[PDB]
């Protein structure tokens, strides 16, 4: 409550040491109250390097592309994916620099961002993502979003389930004015970003305190979406503008990620960004002790067969098991308070 009040989007200079130590970094950056935020930046060591060289992924296939259609006004739009046909990086990189797709010209990032908000219906661009893969070389131990070494591999280990980008990397291929529309992850969970090569990825929070608000916002402008689905913005197709978000009074945050650097999302963390031009980032799902009370409190999409469901029995008989039976008779009347940290930052406490 009095670590990090105003909820701002903190960044982290970690050094090599504390660097080695992805769980127990992450459970220090919530004794200064990141997780408050929604988002957090983490600038890895200057001698940390994921890849030698970016040069040998020219024949990489990107499995579906997506043409990002783009409806609305009044800073309220709604997004259309149209898959496009197996490319590869080389093509899409092409396509990504060519001058129908290129970033326009601009000075400060503030006249970036109004020609995004200006344009984003306009002139459909193709983002090359979902891609499952890694970028890391092998031998890298240090924050692998291939091997994190989470309480959330449970899932993997003991249920067995494989939920791809969730519990494996995903890769991402983005090209100026692509999207991703207002969301937090699946199961309410943490994700890690690592913007490998290329223009910068901007984003936008709202605190997990307040992500409320946005909801009953987006309600109120969607309410054929909130009667189709109790949870429609999972669909991940909502694109609300900064502006619109000040106009009632949600409190929001803005970052721009640069080549080199980390995104934290935070349980229950709404987000939504664009990409200034062709670039690579990397990402997965986590998880700490703290989320396991998220996951088995998430508002899951109903109208859709095939959404991110993990059975949470497993983590509640090993983190939770006093807590167990009250939960199965469906008596746990627990309240979530987001501005306490992780039981893990207690060392830093
Ligand atoms: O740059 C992005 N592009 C696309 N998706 C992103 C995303 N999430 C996507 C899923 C699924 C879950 N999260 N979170 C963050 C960033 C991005
Ligand atoms: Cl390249
Ligand atoms: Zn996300
Ligand atoms: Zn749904």
Redesign the pocket.
């Known amino acids: 409550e009095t670590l990090n009040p105003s909820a701002r989007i903190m960044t982290f200079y970690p050094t090599m040491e504390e660097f080695r130590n992805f769980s127990r970094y992450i459970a220090y950056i919530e004794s200064q109250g990141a997780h408050r935020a929604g988002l957090a930046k983490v600038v890895p060591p200057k001698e940390w390097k994921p890849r030698a060289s970016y040069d040998d992924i020219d024949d990489l296939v990107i499995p579906a592309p997506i043409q990002q259609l783009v409806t609305g006004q009044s800073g309220l739009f709604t997004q259309y994916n149209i898959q496009k046909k197996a490319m590869t990086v080389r093509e899409f990189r092409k396509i990504a620099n060519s001058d129908k797709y290129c970033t326009p010209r601009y000075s400060e990032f503030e006249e970036l961002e109004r020609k995004y908000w200006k344009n984003l219906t306009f002139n459909p661009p193709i983002?090359g993502?979902?891609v499952n893969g890694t970028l890391y070389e092998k031998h890298v131990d240090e924050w692998n979003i291939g091997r994190l070494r989470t309480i959330l591999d449970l899932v993997e280990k003991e249920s067995g389930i494989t939920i791809e980008?969730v519990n494996t990397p995903?890769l991402?291929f983005?090209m100026w004015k692509?999207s991703?529309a207002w969301?937090t992850?699946?199961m309410d969970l943490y994700?890690i970003?690592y913007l490998h090569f290329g223009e910068p990825?901007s984003?936008y929070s709202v605190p997990p305190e307040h992500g409320k608000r946005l909801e009953r916002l987006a309600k109120g402008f969607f309410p054929g979406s909130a009667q189709s689905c109790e949870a429609f913005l999972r669909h991940?197709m909502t694109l609300i503008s900064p502006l619109m978000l000040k106009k009632y009074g949600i409190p929001f945050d803005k970052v721009t990620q640069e080549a080199g650097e980390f995104?934290i999302?935070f349980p229950y963390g709404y987000?939504a960004?664009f990409?200034h031009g062709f670039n690579c980032?990397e990402?997965t799902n986590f998880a700490t002790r703290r989320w396991i009370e998220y996951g088995k409190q998430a508002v899951l999409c109903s109208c859709r067969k095939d959404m991110v469901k993990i059975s949470m029995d497993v983590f509640v008989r090993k983190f939770q098991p006093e807590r167990y039976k009250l939960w199965k008779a469906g008596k746990d009347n627990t309240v979530i308070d987001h501005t306490l940290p992780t039981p893990e930052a207690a060392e830093f406490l």
């Open positions: 983002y993502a979902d980008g995903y991402y983005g692509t991703f969301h992850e699946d994700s970003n990825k984003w991940k995104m999302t987000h960004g990409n980032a990402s």
